[PDB]
Nucleic acid binder design. Structure first.
Length: 125
RNA sequence: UGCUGUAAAGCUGGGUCGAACGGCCUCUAGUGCAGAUCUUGGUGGUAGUAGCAAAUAUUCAAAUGAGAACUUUGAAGACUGA
């Protein structure tokens, strides 16, 4: 990629860990929750039940936090926030905050181009 | 619309909207819900379903009126039966 070379990015689990029975009742949100019931088939890990988060799924430390382009994304809220990315342009990319006005978003886009900083969401409002 | 995190979650594109709000270092608590025949409010399936069958009984025409089985008048047929 255009960023600093990295090993191939491996995601051990690319699906979303969904809470058990969040498909069954509207009141049960999909935010992950661990089953604590005495009889739970999910907690006892029966064959055929949903996969559950555990530390074995952790990302390789050399590719953790990197987006598909190979950049670590940094939230930028103003022009002066781009300064800390001055020497890290091949490893860090700027993401303009959703609450930045259209006037200031043009200004941040212009400064980033001047400094060579990648912007992850150029096409904002 | 996508991105990050094993995860709790975090960020972002588009739409809606109209007056406040956030990151970081700390402090503090009335701080996290699926259950308690939980509380209050709201809403379903059931379902256009059960049903709207006691007390003999109504009918023709005219008027009115946007509209008349159900209002008024006339003509009948009835009943309460002191």
């Amino acid at each position: 990629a255009t960023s600093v070379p990295h090993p191939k990015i491996v995601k051990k689990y690319t699906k979303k860990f969904k809470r058990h029975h969040s498909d069954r009742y509207h009141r049960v949100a999909e935010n992950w929750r661990k089953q604590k019931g005495i009889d739970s088939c999910v907690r006892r890990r029966f064959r055929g039940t949903i996969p559950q988060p555990n530390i074995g799924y952790g990302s390789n430390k050399k590719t953790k936090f990197l987006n598909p382009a190979g950049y670590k994304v940094y939230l930028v809220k103003n022009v002066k926030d781009l300064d800390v990315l001055l020497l890290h342009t091949k490893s860090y990319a700027a993401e303009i905050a959703s609450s930045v006005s259209s006037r200031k978003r043009v200004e941040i886009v212009a400064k980033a181009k001047k400094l060579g900083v990648k912007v992850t969401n150029p096409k904002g409002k």
